[PDB]
Design a protein around this ligand. Structure first.
Ligand SMILES: CCCCCCCC(=O)OC[C@H](COP(=O)(O)O[C@@H]1[C@H](O)[C@H](O)[C@@H](OP(=O)(O)O)[C@H](OP(=O)(O)O)[C@H]1O)OC(=O)CCCCCCC
Ligand SMILES: CCCCCCCC(=O)OC[C@H](COP(=O)(O)O[C@@H]1[C@H](O)[C@H](O)[C@@H](OP(=O)(O)O)[C@H](OP(=O)(O)O)[C@H]1O)OC(=O)CCCCCCC
Lengths: 344, 144, 344, 144, 344, 344, 144, 144
C-alpha cells in the first residue's frame, strides 16, 4: 500500500523525466529555458564591457544549474529503477549504461569542475572554462531521443533527393555563370570585382539574398546582368528551403491520414487475447501441444499486430472490393446452378 | 528431457496420424476442426508458416520440437506484452479500469467467454477505486 | 408592421456590425482603414520635421474617429438588443458585459480624454497622449473574435511541432557552429569579429538573410566558411516559414474537402423535424410519455447533427461498403438456403 | 407533484409491462412497434443510451423521472433550435420562404405528413411577400 | 477552292494571333521580347551617360515596333473577320469594338505620334515622349485575356483569406512591438533610432529581410531583442508568400486531378447528337411536337454537358455505390420473394 | 569459370560506373568532391595573395585528377564492353560514340594538355589554362543522364506556367510602379535616385530582398511608399520559388503514390511468360501459325506491360466497380428470369 | 399565326388526352412510350422541368406554346453547337476527319442508326483528303 | 520462299475456313477454342488489333504474311526481354535464384505447367550456389 504508492509516484517521476508528455514537456521546456539562459549569459561573458556582471550572474546561475541537474539526475536514476528493468543496483547500473545517462553524468561532473575552477581561479582551468561552458548544449542534444530530428531531416532529404539535387545543380550553374559574367563586365570599373573569387563571393551573397552591400555592381551593364541573374538565382537558391518545407508539411499530412486510418485496434486486441491464451497454456501431451498451438497463435497475432502498423492504402480497399467482386461472381454462379437444379 | 521429448513425439504422432512425419495444412485443419474450430485455409497457411523455418511448407518433427523447446516467458515476449497493454492505456500511468478492460476483451479481437474473463478479473486485485495495475498482470502471466 | 420593420432593420444593423459578412466586411475594412490612418498619422507625429502638420491633421482625424466610433458603439448596443437576448435594459447591460464591448467603451472614453487633453495641453496628459494613441489598435484586436487568428496559428504550430522543432534545432546548431568557426577564422584580421557575441550577431543576421553588412568576413577562409554555412543555415532558417505556409495551405485544402463532403444537411433537417415533434408534444400519461420519447428523439437527432459536424473520412465509406459485403454474404446465404428448400 | 409522479409511474408501468422496473431494448422496441413503427436495433440502443446516465444500459424508473422532469423549453435548447433554423437560412436575415421550408420538411430528414405541415404553415403568419420569420416560430414552439 | 484555302489560312492567322497555342505562343513570346527590349532601351534613355546611344538605337527599334505592330494589327483585323462573326465591314467594326482592339489602335497611333515628334523635336512632345513610351506595356496588358492572371490571384487570395489575415495580423503585431522595444532600447545610444518612425522603418526593413543596413542596432540589449523579434517576424513576413505559393501549387494539383477525372466526353457527344436531332426536326402537328421534344432534349443534354463541366468528387462515387447498395437490397428482396413463391 | 567471374566483376564495375546505385553513388560522390575541390583551388588560384600556394597544390591535385579519371575512363570502357552490346573492338568504339564518353575523352586530353603546359610555362597556354580548368565542370555535367535535372525543372515550370506567369506579371507591375513612385518622390532629395534606371535598380534589389543598401529612400514619404510596395513586391518575388518548391514536393508525393499503386508486377510476369512461349515456338504449318499467335501474345503482353506503366487512377476503380454494377444487374436479371421459369 | 397556334393546340391535345390542360410526368411518359422509347422517371422529371418556368411541375398549354415559339436557330445555340464541335477538335483548325466523327457518333453519347449517319456524312462534302469542315455543317443545320 | 509462303497460306486457310480471305474475331475465337482455350471477346479484339495495320479490324492474308515474316529475334525484342528480366532482379547483378523464379513463373502472370517449368530450369545451368544468370537464358531463347 504505502510502498505501492511509493513506486507509483516513482513511476510518475520516471514518466515526466524520461517519457515527456503533456506537462512533462512543460517541465522540460523550463529546463531548456534554463540551459538557454546559461548559454546566453555565457555568450555575454565574452563581451568585455559586460564581462564583470555577466560572469557575476553566471556564477550564481551555474550554481543553480548544478543543483537542479544533480537533483534531476538522481531522481531520474531512482525513477528509472522503478520500471522493474532497471530495479536494484544492477538495474541502476544498466540505466547508467545508457549513452545519454553517462553523457549527463560527465556534463554534471564537468559543471562542478567549472564551479570549482571559478572558485579557485586557475589560469589553466580559466582557459578551459569556456569550452566547459559549451558542454551545456549537451542537455538539448540529449533531449533528442535516438537523434529523431536528424533522422527526420535525413528522411525528407532522401525522399526529395532528386529535386534537391536539381535545385542545387541549376543554382550552382547560375551562380558560376552569373558571377563570371559580372566579373567580366566589372573587372575594371569596379575594384571590389578585381578577382574572380571576389565575384564568386558577390554572387553567393546576392543569390542567397543576403546582400551585404560590400560588393555591388556599378557599371550599368553589370547591374542589368546582375538583376537578371539575381532573379533566376534567388529563385533557385530559395528552392531547397521550399522543397524541404513542403516535404515536411506533406509528411505531416500523410502521418495524420495514417493515424485516422489506424485499424490496428482490433488486431492488437487479438494479440492481447492470444497472449492471454498462451498464458492459460502455461492428457499431458494434449496440454503441451495446445500450448504449442497457443504460442503459434501468439506469433500470428503479433504478425497481424505488425501488418496493422503498416499504414492504410487505397490499393488495399481496391483489393478488398475486388474480393467483393469475386465473391459476387461465385455467388451468382452457385445461385444459377441451383436454380437450374430446381428447373430440372 | 526424455519425458519431454516423449511427450512432444506423442503430440506430433497425434497430429500426424501417419508415417509421413510432416504436418500439412489439410491434416492440421482436419485435426483442429475435430474439436469444432472451423478455421480458414489462409489460417492454416499462416499457422504452418509461423512454425516452419526451411520454407518447404510442412512442419517436420524437428521443427515442432524446436518451436516447443523455447520457453514462453521471454524478455522480448514480455516487452511485446507490455507494449500491447500500453496500446489501450489512459495517460500511460500503468493502470487500467476493470470496465474498459472488460469491454475490450468482450468486443475487440478474439471475443472470449465470460467465464474466463470473470476468472481472470477475479484472479488479481480488482479493487482500488476500480483501477487495477496491468504490470502486476504482466508479471503473473509470464511466470510460466 | 412599422415596429416590425424597425426591429428588422435593427437586426440588419446588428448583422453588419457584430456579424460581418459580404459588404459588412467592406464596412469593417473601411473602419480598419481609418484606424490604420490614425496610427500612421500618430507615427508621423513622432517626426519633428512633420510634427506640426501631423498633429494638426491628427486632431481632426481623432475628432472624426471619436464621432464615428461613438455612433458605431450606440448603434451596436441597440442592434444587439434587437436579438431578444440583449433586449431591454438588462439585455443591453449583458451585452456591455462582453469583454469587447467594455474594451470599446474604455477605448472610446480614452479617446475623448485624448481630445480633451489636446484641447487643454496638460503636460501630464501630453506625456500620456502617445500611450493613449496606442490604444486604437484595440479596434483591430477586437475585430478578431475569440482570438481566432491566434488559435489558428497555434493549431498549425502544434500540428507541425515536431518538424518546427527539427528545423529550429538544426538551424540553431548551424548558427552556433558557423558563428564560432567564423569567429575563430576572423578573430584577428577583422575587428568587428572581436568577441564571439559579435560573431553570433553576424551569424544571426546572415542566416536569416537580413545581411545588414555591418559585419562581413574579410579573410578568404572566413568567406569560404561563411558561404558554405550560410547556404545551409539560410535553408534551415527559411524552413519554419515554409513549413507553416504549407501547413496553412494544406489546412485550407482539408477544410475545402470537408466542406464539399458535408452531409449534415439531412441529419440537420431530422433534428429540426424532431424538434417540431417535441414541440407538438408540449390519455394524459400516454401523451406525457410520448413527449418524453419525442425529447429523446430530439437529443438523438442532436447527436446525429453533431456526428455529421465531424468531417468525412474515406475510412467511413470503407466501413460503409464493408457493410455492403456482409450484406451480400447474408443475402447469398439466404438465397442458397431457400433454393435448397425448393430443391427439397 | 404527486399527480405528475403518478402519471410518470403509470407511463413507466405501461412501458415495462412487468416488475423488472427497468427498460430493455427489446421490450421498448416491442412496445413502440405495437403502434406500427418498425425501428432498428441500433435505434433502440441509441434511444436507451440517450436516457441512461449510469451506463448499465437499462432505463430505471428514476432515470425516466429525471428525464421527464426537465422542461423542454430551455436556453440551450432554444439556441440549438435557432442555429438549426439558421442552417437553412438565406443571407442570415432571420426570414425563410414558405416554399423552401415546405420542400425541406417534405424531403430532408424525417418526412412529415402533409396535414401536419399545412397545419404548422397556417399556424403562423405566412404572408409578407412569401417570407415568414422563423424567430417568431422559435418563440411560439418553445412556449411549452 | 482557292477562296476556300484563302479563308482557311486567314483562320489560321486568327488562331495564331487571337488564340495562342503551341507555336503561336512562341510568336507572342517574340513580340513580348520586342516590347521588353523597347522598355529596357527606354529606361536606358534615362541615363545621361548613355542617353545618346540609347535614344539613337531606340529610334530604329521604335520604327521596327510601329511597322510590326501595324502589320499584326491589320492581319488581326482580317483574320478576325474570317470567323464569320466579324466578317464584312460591320463585323470588322464589331471586332474593333473589342476593348483590346481599340487599346491596340490607340497605342499604335500614339507610337506613330512618338516617332513623328522625335523627327520634329517639339519640346512639348519631347516632354510627353516618355509618358508615350510607357504605353508599350499595354501590349503585355492586352496579352492577358479578361484579366485572367488578376482573377487567379484574387481567387487564391480569397481562398486563403483567413490565413493571410492571420499572418498579416501577427506580423504587424510583431513589427509594432519589436520596433517599439528596439526604439526604447536604442533611443539614446543610437542616433538613427531617434524617432519611433525611424524604428518602424528599421523594423520593416529587418523583418522583410531586406536589411539595408542604414539603421542597425548597436547596444547589445538592442541586438538581442532585434535578433529574437527578427526571427519571429521574418518567419511571419515570409508566411504570405509561402501560403500563396502553396495555394497556387495545390490549385494546380486540383486542376490536374479534375482534368483526369473529366467524364464530359460522352455527355458532350450526347449534346452533339441531340443537336443533330433538333436539326433533323427543322402529320404536320406531330412533326412540330417532335421538334419541340427534340429542342427539349437539346436543352437537357446542354444541362448534362454543364453538370459534367462540374469536376469530379469522391462524394459522387459514394452516392454512386450507395445506389449500388439500394440496388442490391431490392434485388435480394425480389429474389427471396419469388423463391418463396416457388416454395409455395 | 575463371573467365565467368572475370566478366561478372567486369559487369559489377560497369554497374558502379555507368549505373550508380547505393555505394556507387558514394563512389561518384567522392569523384564529385574531387572535382569540386579542384574547382575551389582553381578559384583560389585567382587570388594573388594565395596564387602561389593555390597553384602549387593545384598542380598535384590536377595530377591526381588526371590519373584517377584516366583509370576510371579505361575501366569504364572495359566494363561497358562487358555488356555484350559494346563487346569487342566494334562495341568499344560504339560506347566511345556516346556523347558523354567523347566528352570525357576530350576533357581528359585537355587536362593532360593543362599539365603539360604548366610544366612548360607557355604564355599562350598559360592564358588558355584557366579556360581549360573550367572544363572540369563537364564531369558534373556528364553525371546528369539525358539532362534529367533540366527536364524535371522544365516539366514543373510547364505544369505551373500559368501561375508562374501570374506571379511574374504582377511582380513586374509592382516593380515598375513602385520604382517609378519612389523615383518621383526622391528624384530631388536623394541623389542616388537621380535617374529612373537607378530607381529600377533600387526596386529590383529591394523587392528581391537583397537590399544592398547602396540606394535607400531618405524622404519620409519615399520610405512609406517603399515600405508598402516592398511588402507587396517581396511577396510576389518570393512567389515563384514557393510555387516551384510546392510543385516539386507535390510531384514527389504523386510519384510515391504511383509507386505504391504499381500493379505492373503480374502483367510484367505475363509478358515474360508469353516471351518464353514465343521462344518455345522457335504439322509444320500448325507450328508456324502457333508461333505467329505466340508472337501476337508477346506483343499484347508488352502492351499490357506498358498500360501498367501508366500510373493508377481513382477513375480506374470507379470504372472497375462500375463494371461491378453492370455485373450485379445482369446477375439479378438472370436470377429472376430463371426463378420465374421455376414458378412456371 | 392562327395556323401555327392551331397546330400547337392540336399537338398539346394529342399529348394531354384529357381536359386537364397540363402535362404530367406519367402521361408524357406513357405517350412517348407508345412509340417504344421506355425512358426513365428521372428522364420525365428532367424533361418536364426543362419546359416549365413556374416551378409547379406541369407543362400547361401557354408554356408549351412559349417553348415552341422561340426559333431553334439562335446565336447562343449556334455558339453552343460550335463549341460542342470544338470539344472533339484536333488542333482547333476547324476541320474533322470522317472516320473519327463516325466513331464518335457510333459510340459516344446517343448511338444513332447507321442509316442516318451515312445520310448526314453524304449530305456535305466529305472529300478533301478525308477532312471535312464542321463550320459548314454548323451553317447548314442551323438554317431551320 | 515458295515453301514459306505455301506454309503461311496453308495456315491462313486453316484459320479462315472460307473464301472470305480475312480473319474476324468470332472465327478466330472459334478456331482457338477448338483446342480448348475459352478466351474473351476483348481478347479477340486485342489479338486482331495487334495484327491489323489498316484499322479495318480484320486480318487479311497480306497482314498475316507480314506479321510472320519478321523474325522473332530482334534487337528491340532482346532489349524488352532483358528489361523484363531486370524487373524481377535483386541488386541488378544479372543473376536470379531458381526458387524465386519458380515462384514467379508459378504465380505471377500466365501460370505455366510444372513440366515445362522444370524443363526450362534443367535446360540451363541451375548450379552455382542456387543462382543462375538470366543473360545466358536471354541469349539462348533469342537464338530462334
Ligand atoms: C508558437 C507560439 C506558441 C504556440 C502554442 C500554441 C499551440 C497550442 O498550444 O495548440 C493548442 C491546441 C491544440 O489542440 P487542437 O484543437 O488544435 O488539435 C486537435 C486535436 O489535436 C485532435 O486530436 C486532432 O485530431 P487527431 O486525433 O490528431 O487526428 C485535430 O486534428 P484534425 O483531425 O481535426 O484535423 C486537432 O484539431 O490548438 C490551439 O488551440 C492553438 C491555440 C493557440 C494559442 C497560443 C498561441 C501561441
Ligand atoms: C489582394 C488584393 C485584393 C484581392 C481581392 C480579390 C479576391 C476576390 O475578390 O475574390 C473574388 C472571387 C471569389 O469567388 P470565386 O469564384 O473565385 O470562388 C468560387 C466560389 O467561392 C465557390 O463557392 C467555391 O466552391 P465552394 O462552395 O467553396 O466549395 C469555388 O471553389 P472550388 O470548389 O471550385 O474549388 C470558388 O471557385 O474570385 C475572383 O474572381 C478574384 C478576382 C480578383 C480581382 C481583384 C484582384 C485584387
Amino acid at each position: 500500500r504505502r510502498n505501492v504508492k511509493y513506486r507509483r509516484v516513482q513511476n510518475y517521476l520516471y514518466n515526466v523525466l524520461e517519457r515527456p508528455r503533456g506537462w512533462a514537456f512543460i517541465y522540460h521546456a523550463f529546463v531548456f529555458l534554463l540551459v538557454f539562459g546559461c548559454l546566453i549569459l555565457s555568450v555575454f561573458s565574452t563581451i568585455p564591457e559586460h564581462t564583470k556582471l555577466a560572469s557575476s550572474c553566471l556564477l550564481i546561475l551555474e550554481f543553480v544549474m548544478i543543483v537542479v541537474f544533480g537533483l534531476e539526475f538522481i531522481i531520474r536514476i531512482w525513477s528509472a529503477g522503478c520500471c522493474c528493468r532497471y530495479r536494484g543496483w544492477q538495474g541502476r547500473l544498466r540505466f547508467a549504461r545508457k549513452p545519454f545517462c553517462v553523457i549527463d553524468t560527465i556534463v554534471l561532473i564537468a559543471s562542478i569542475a567549472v564551479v570549482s575552477a571559478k572558485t579557485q581561479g586557475n589560469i589553466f582551468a580559466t582557459s578551459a572554462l569556456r569550452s566547459l561552458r559549451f558542454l551545456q548544449i549537451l542537455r538539448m542534444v540529449r533531449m533528442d531521443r535516438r537523434g529523431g530530428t536528424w533522422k527526420l531531416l535525413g528522411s525528407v532529404v532522401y525522399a526529395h533527393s532528386k529535386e534537391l539535387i536539381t535545385a542545387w545543380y541549376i543554382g550552382f550553374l547560375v551562380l558560376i555563370f552569373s558571377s563570371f559574367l559580372v566579373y567580366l563586365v566589372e573587372k575594371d570599373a569596379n575594384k571590389e570585382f578585381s578577382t574572380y573569387a571576389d565575384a564568386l563571393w558577390w554572387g553567393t551573397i546576392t543569390l542567397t539574398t543576403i546582400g551585404y552591400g560590400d560588393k555591388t555592381p556599378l557599371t550599368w551593364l553589370g547591374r542589368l546582368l546582375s538583376a537578371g541573374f539575381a532573379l533566376l538565382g534567388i529563385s533557385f537558391f530559395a528552392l531547397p528551403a521550399g522543397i524541404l518545407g513542403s516535404g515536411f508539411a506533406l509528411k505531416v499530412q500523410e502521418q495524420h491520414r495514417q493515424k485516422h486510418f489506424e485499424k490496428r485496434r482490433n488486431p492488437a486486441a487479438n494479440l492481447i487475447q492470444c497472449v492471454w491464451r498462451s498464458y492459460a497454456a502455461d492428457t499431458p501431451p494434449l496440454k503441451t501441444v495446445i500450448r504449442a498451438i497457443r504460442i503459434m497463435k501468439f506469433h500470428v497475432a503479433k504478425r497481424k499486430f505488425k501488418e496493422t502498423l503498416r499504414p492504410y492504402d487505397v490499393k488495399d480497399v481496391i483489393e478488398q472490393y475486388s474480393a467483393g467482386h469475386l465473391d459476387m461472381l461465385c455467388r451468382i454462379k452457385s445461385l444459377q446452378t441451383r436454380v437450374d437444379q430446381i428447373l430440372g | 528431457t526424455e519425458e519431454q521429448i516423449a511427450e512432444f513425439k506423442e503430440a506430433f504422432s497425434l497430429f500426424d496420424k501417419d508415417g509421413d512425419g510432416t504436418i500439412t495444412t489439410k491434416e492440421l485443419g482436419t485435426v483442429m476442426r475435430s474439436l469444432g474450430q472451423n478455421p480458414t485455409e489462409a489460417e492454416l497457411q499462416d499457422m504452418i508458416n509461423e512454425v516452419d523455418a526451411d520454407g518447404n511448407g510442412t512442419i517436420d518433427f524437428p521443427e515442432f520440437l524446436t518451436m516447443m523447446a523455447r520457453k514462453m516467458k521471454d524478455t522480448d515476449s514480455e516487452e511485446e506484452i507490455r507494449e500491447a497493454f500500453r496500446v489501450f492505456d489512459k495517460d500511460g500511468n500503468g493502470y487500467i479500469s476493470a470496465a474498459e478492460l472488460r469491454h475490450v476483451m468482450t468486443n475487440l479481437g478474439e471475443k472470449l467467454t465470460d467465464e474466463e474473463v470473470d476468472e481472470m478479473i477475479r484472479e488479481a486485485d480488482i479493487d482500488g477505486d476500480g483501477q487495477v495495475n496491468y504490470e502486476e498482470f504482466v508479471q503473473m502471466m509470464t511466470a510460466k
